[PDB]
């Protein structure tokens, strides 16, 4: 019959606690449906106190009723606070040492510290038995973030592999003048080899032609470096890649076979959030 502190997509935390009450004007026999409270990690424990006081019967002493006092305890314990980040997933021990926490402690700070144990206590004044709520683990607090990071990193791959094929089907075509340059030399080889070893004319005649052709290829490269070859012609290569990245209407959500504003910095910005949460809980990720 233990309570829960659940995490939501937003920063809020939903608190399920089964109060043992219901046949009560004042609590000083079926219980009432467990209380579900929505709290923020930045509001103090005193606000969580007056939240539970509203969904609870008054406390009567003699002629007057008064709001019950609520005390939160945790297993907190030589000079370094032993953090585990396991929470309810921890090992548990026979009997634990509890300490009171100040009503000014923010719920977020109190929860991450109490994660050293498997549960934190909630005591309502006037009722002898204390309640138990299982502290969320580090993995619990980052469930929607991790599950969304897995979703982000998978759509990125469905979008990267089409930029991959777009950026590889643009090299076999752009390297056509490189293979043609090799064919020009090998064909020029065969002309020189044939005339020397299969023709009467000697090196007196062919060598100047090989020199005039050498200067021609040098000047051909000078007229080539006199185009967009100087500095970075990647702008011309980027235009061919941009034309190859045509839009596709295949998938309504996570559209396949297209390319645009790849927002990967949110997948990294989300990972920075999950790792910062692991550090304050004192764990690796």
């Amino acid at each position: 019959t233990k309570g829960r502190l659940l995490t939501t997509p937003t920063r809020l935390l939903k608190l399920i606690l089964p109060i043992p009450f219901h046949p009560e004007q004042e609590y000083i026999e079926d219980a009432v449906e467990p209380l579900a409270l929505l709290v923020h990690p930045q509001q103090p424990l005193s606000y969580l106190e007056r939240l539970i006081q509203a969904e609870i019967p008054p406390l009567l002493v003699k002629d007057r009723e008064k709001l019950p006092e609520i005390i939160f305890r945790a297993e907190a314990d030589s000079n370094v606070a032993s953090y585990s980040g396991l929470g309810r997933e921890g090992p548990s021990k026979g009997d634990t040492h509890w300490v009171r926490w100040s009503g000014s402690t923010e719920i977020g700070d109190f929860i991450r510290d109490a994660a050293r144990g498997r549960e934190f206590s909630v005591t309502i004044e006037g009722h002898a038995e204390e309640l138990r709520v299982a502290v969320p683990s580090f993995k619990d607090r980052t469930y929607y973030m991790r599950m969304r990071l897995r979703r982000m990193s998978q759509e990125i791959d469905q979008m990267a592999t089409v930029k991959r094929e777009c950026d590889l089907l643009a090299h076999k075509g752009a390297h056509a003048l490189a293979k043609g340059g090799f064919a020009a030399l090998a064909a020029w080889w065969g002309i020189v080899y044939y005339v020397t070893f299969h023709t009467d004319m000697g090196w007196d005649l062919v060598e100047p032609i090989t020199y005039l052709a050498g200067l021609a290829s040098i000047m051909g490269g000078y007229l080539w470096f006199l185009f967009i070859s100087r500095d970075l012609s990647y702008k011309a290569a980027m235009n061919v890649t941009v034309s190859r990245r045509q839009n596709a209407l295949y998938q309504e959500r996570g559209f396949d076979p297209a390319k645009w504003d790849q927002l990967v910095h949110d997948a990294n910005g989300l990972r920075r959030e999950i790792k910062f949460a692991a550090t304050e809980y004192g764990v690796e990720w």
């Epitope: 044939y194 020397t196 070893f197 299969h198 023709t199 009467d200």
Partner: nanobody, 117 residues
Framework: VQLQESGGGLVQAGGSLRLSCAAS????????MGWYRQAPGKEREFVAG???????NYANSVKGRFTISRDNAKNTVYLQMNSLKPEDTAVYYC????????????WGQGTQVTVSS
Amino acid sequence: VQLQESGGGLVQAGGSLRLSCAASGTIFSPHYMGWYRQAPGKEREFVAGIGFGTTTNYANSVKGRFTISRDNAKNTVYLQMNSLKPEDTAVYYCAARLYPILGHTYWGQGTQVTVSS
């Protein structure tokens, strides 16, 4: 692809003779084409030869007296043999190689040259 020769015959010592051989069946121009002789009992010996990329050399007994000459247009080997002797007597053959593989691959029909004594 094979060669045929024509020009052999009889002539006495100190005479002259011109030898001709025509290569045919080649898609290209052959690299090497030369002349070889065969004494009545000895082996096939080298007389004269012209490799296009390589040398144009004669044999020792041949040097100074005969002249080999190729014309690649008509693809014909010529051997002008002057100052003949009885030791010049042999069956003369036409050998050709399409590529510079040192050795001999293609052979001709053969013409006899006789120098009496």
